Design an enzyme around this catalytic site. Structure first.
Site, PDB file in Angstrom:
ATOM      1  N   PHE A 126       0.829  -1.195   0.000  1.00 53.71           N
ATOM      2  CA  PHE A 126       0.000   0.000   0.000  1.00 53.71           C
ATOM      3  C   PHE A 126       0.877   1.264   0.000  1.00 53.71           C
ATOM      4  O   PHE A 126       1.831   1.360   0.778  1.00 53.71           O
ATOM      5  CB  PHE A 126      -0.909  -0.037   1.238  1.00 53.71           C
ATOM      6  CG  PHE A 126      -1.696   1.219   1.453  1.00 53.71           C
ATOM      7  CD1 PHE A 126      -1.260   2.173   2.374  1.00 53.71           C
ATOM      8  CD2 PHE A 126      -2.874   1.456   0.720  1.00 53.71           C
ATOM      9  CE1 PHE A 126      -1.983   3.352   2.538  1.00 53.71           C
ATOM     10  CE2 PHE A 126      -3.615   2.617   0.887  1.00 53.71           C
ATOM     11  CZ  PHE A 126      -3.166   3.573   1.798  1.00 53.71           C
ATOM     12  N   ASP A 157      -1.234   1.042 -19.666  1.00 50.93           N
ATOM     13  CA  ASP A 157      -2.234   1.995 -19.234  1.00 50.93           C
ATOM     14  C   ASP A 157      -1.720   2.882 -18.109  1.00 50.93           C
ATOM     15  O   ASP A 157      -2.341   3.060 -17.141  1.00 50.93           O
ATOM     16  CB  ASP A 157      -3.528   1.269 -18.851  1.00 50.93           C
ATOM     17  CG  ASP A 157      -4.698   2.200 -18.611  1.00 50.93           C
ATOM     18  OD1 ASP A 157      -4.977   3.080 -19.417  1.00 50.93           O
ATOM     19  OD2 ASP A 157      -5.352   2.029 -17.607  1.00 50.93           O
TER      20      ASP A 157
HETATM   21  C1  LIG Z   1      -8.007  10.993  -3.538  1.00 53.73           C
HETATM   22  C2  LIG Z   1      -7.981   9.889  -2.495  1.00 53.73           C
HETATM   23  N1  LIG Z   1      -7.276   8.707  -2.999  1.00 53.73           N
HETATM   24  C3  LIG Z   1      -8.141   7.684  -3.602  1.00 53.73           C
HETATM   25  C4  LIG Z   1      -8.364   8.012  -5.059  1.00 53.73           C
HETATM   26  C5  LIG Z   1      -5.937   8.654  -2.900  1.00 53.73           C
HETATM   27  O1  LIG Z   1      -5.227   9.659  -2.961  1.00 53.73           O
HETATM   28  C6  LIG Z   1      -5.159   7.392  -2.752  1.00 53.73           C
HETATM   29  C7  LIG Z   1      -5.107   6.545  -3.850  1.00 53.73           C
HETATM   30  C8  LIG Z   1      -4.377   5.380  -3.791  1.00 53.73           C
HETATM   31  C9  LIG Z   1      -3.663   5.043  -2.636  1.00 53.73           C
HETATM   32  N2  LIG Z   1      -2.961   3.894  -2.517  1.00 53.73           N
HETATM   33  C10 LIG Z   1      -2.941   2.866  -3.385  1.00 53.73           C
HETATM   34  N3  LIG Z   1      -3.782   2.726  -4.441  1.00 53.73           N
HETATM   35  C11 LIG Z   1      -3.660   1.690  -5.289  1.00 53.73           C
HETATM   36  O2  LIG Z   1      -4.485   1.535  -6.367  1.00 53.73           O
HETATM   37  C12 LIG Z   1      -5.456   2.534  -6.741  1.00 53.73           C
HETATM   38  C13 LIG Z   1      -6.110   2.202  -8.085  1.00 53.73           C
HETATM   39  C14 LIG Z   1      -5.073   2.142  -9.221  1.00 53.73           C
HETATM   40  C15 LIG Z   1      -5.758   1.792 -10.548  1.00 53.73           C
HETATM   41  C16 LIG Z   1      -6.772   2.862 -10.921  1.00 53.73           C
HETATM   42  C17 LIG Z   1      -7.790   3.055  -9.793  1.00 53.73           C
HETATM   43  C18 LIG Z   1      -7.167   3.258  -8.407  1.00 53.73           C
HETATM   44  C19 LIG Z   1      -2.676   0.749  -5.054  1.00 53.73           C
HETATM   45  N4  LIG Z   1      -2.308  -0.369  -5.697  1.00 53.73           N
HETATM   46  C20 LIG Z   1      -1.262  -0.882  -5.039  1.00 53.73           C
HETATM   47  N5  LIG Z   1      -0.983  -0.100  -3.977  1.00 53.73           N
HETATM   48  C21 LIG Z   1      -1.846   0.902  -3.977  1.00 53.73           C
HETATM   49  N6  LIG Z   1      -1.987   1.953  -3.177  1.00 53.73           N
HETATM   50  C22 LIG Z   1      -3.700   5.921  -1.529  1.00 53.73           C
HETATM   51  C23 LIG Z   1      -4.450   7.094  -1.595  1.00 53.73           C
END
Ligand SMILES: CCN(CC)C(=O)c1ccc(Nc2nc(OCC3CCCCC3)c3[nH]cnc3n2)cc1
Length: 279
Positions: free
Chosen positions: A78, A123
């Site tokens: 994460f 992508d």
């Molecule tokens: C505005 C608030 N957000 C949520 C939008 C954040 O800033 C936020 C986003 C993501 C993480 N962390 C995260 N996310 C992933 O995948 C996310 C997906 C990738 C493929 C496309 C769709 C999303 C991960 N995969 C493997 N480790 C990951 N860690 C922490 C905070």
């Protein structure tokens, strides 16, 4: 569903929904990707299992692959923020240029690694690019969808993608960090394509040999001329603009590789600054 305490949805990617989750024995917080269909085929488990060895400090670590029952979950390290959010959080001032540079340098290293093992991303987007509090940025995911970052060979119907599609997407992201506007905000395939054409000129047999005989190439395309490149990404300096344009060459074969891009003069004074993140 048993081993993993769902903490929150962080969104859906192309091939599934992604949760922040806590491992019920180990206490590890992780990104849990559920994949969603006819039983989960042989091919995909094997390909996916190859990605457990594709380990680089600029690639989001795939921790575990769980094929249980019919279902498939991918468990990833994460990270705390994505670049999209971080750019939204940076809209008023813009990401400092040394930080932009650092991020580009790091992603090019992740691409150079993956590319030398013959794996593509295909992508790349700001939602896929993940940052931590230590100044690192990582590429996530090698297996309404946004077209903003699609390479023109993909839009023109080439079936056989090369490493050059990632260089293209990275180029578009670079530009976006620099200008705080998306480069090519297409809302359909032809809109995407014609927005590419408007900025870099309609490609022809001169700049891109073989282009006119591609599956969805039409001799009836409007013929726009190249816009001036200092008009496209102010206030990127001459080194950056030069690197950008080698990443945005129409012909995938003339497009700079990740490895060569790492040697470009733009990166001579590269550093690793630490951003301010609000988590
Ligand atoms: C505005 C608030 N957000 C949520 C939008 C954040 O800033 C936020 C986003 C993501 C993480 N962390 C995260 N996310 C992933 O995948 C996310 C997906 C990738 C493929 C496309 C769709 C999303 C991960 N995969 C493997 N480790 C990951 N860690 C922490 C905070």
């Amino acid at each position: 569903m048993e081993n993993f305490q769902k903490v929150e949805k962080i969104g859906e990617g192309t091939y599934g929904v992604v949760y922040k989750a806590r491992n019920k024995l180990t206490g590890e917080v992780v990104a849990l990707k559920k994949i969603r269909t006819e039983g989960v085929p042989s091919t995909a488990i094997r390909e996916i299992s190859l990605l457990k060895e594709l380990n680089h400090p600029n690639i989001v670590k795939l921790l575990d692959v769980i094929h249980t029952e019919n279902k498939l979950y991918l468990v990833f390290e994460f990270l705390h923020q994505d670049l999209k959010k971080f750019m939204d959080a940076s809209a008023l001032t813009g990401i400092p240029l040394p930080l932009i540079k650092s991020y580009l340098f790091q992603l090019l290293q992740g691409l150079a690694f993956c590319h030398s093992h013959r794996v593509l991303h295909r992508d790349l987007k700001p939602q896929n690019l993940l940052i931590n509090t230590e100044g690192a940025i990582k590429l996530a995911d090698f297996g309404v969808v946004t077209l903003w970052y699609r390479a023109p060979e993909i839009l023109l119907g080439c079936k056989y993608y090369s490493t050059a599609v990632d260089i293209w997407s990275l180029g578009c992201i670079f530009a976006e960090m620099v200008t705080r506007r998306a480069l090519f905000p297409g809302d359909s395939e032809i809109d995407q394509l014609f927005r590419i054409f408007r900025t870099l000129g309609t490609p022809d047999e001169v700049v891109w040999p073989g282009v006119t005989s591609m599956p969805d190439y039409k001799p009836s395309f409007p013929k726009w001329a190249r816009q001036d490149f200092s008009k496209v990404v102010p206030p990127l300096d001459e080194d950056g603009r030069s690197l950008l344009s080698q990443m945005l060459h129409y012909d995938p074969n003339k497009r700079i590789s990740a490895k060569a891009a790492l040697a470009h003069p733009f990166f001579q004074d590269v550093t690793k600054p630490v951003p301010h993140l609000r988590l």
